[PDB]
Amino acid sequence: ACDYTCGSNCYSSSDVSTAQAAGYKLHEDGETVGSNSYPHKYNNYEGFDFSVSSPYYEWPILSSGDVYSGGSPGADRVVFNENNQLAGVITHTGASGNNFVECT
Numbered sequence: 001a002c003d004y005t006c007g008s009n010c011y012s013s014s015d016v017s018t019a020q021a022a023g024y025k026l027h028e029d030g031e032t033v034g035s036n037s038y039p040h041k042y043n044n045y046e047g048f049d050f051s052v053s054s055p056y057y058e059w060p061i062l063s064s065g066d067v068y069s070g071g072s073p074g075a076d077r078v079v080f081n082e083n084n085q086l087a088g089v090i091t092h093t094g095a096s097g098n099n100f101v102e103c104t
């Protein structure tokens, strides 16, 4: 079931959970991958009413189902905090410039 729909991409809660665990572990270890250094800080310039508290960090979630490892990040991201709570799933798809919109 599409627990989250990012543009055309459909993700289940397990897909998101898998991505989050990978991103969080890197954050914990103090490691980053990709030229944009993921996972990196998400300042919430869009002003999403996340129910969990910051600091927030974004990490790419891939439609292939693979866990991100350093290449093209695509348009979708899972955002989590230091308590390893999921804040939300967002995407550049349908947003202008380098803005994000929430996945539904």
Ligand SMILES: Nc1nc2c(ncn2[C@@H]2O[C@H](CO)[C@H]3O[P@](O)(=S)O[C@H]32)c(=O)[nH]1
Pocket (backbone or CB within 6 Å): 036, 040, 041, 042, 043, 044, 045, 046, 098, 099, 100
């Ligand atoms: N859109 C957006 N970008 C953010 C936010 N916080 C940090 N960024 C960074 O701001 C720049 C413009 O979006 C990008 O450089 P980057 O470091 S790869 O990660 C993005 C945020 O809340 N929203």
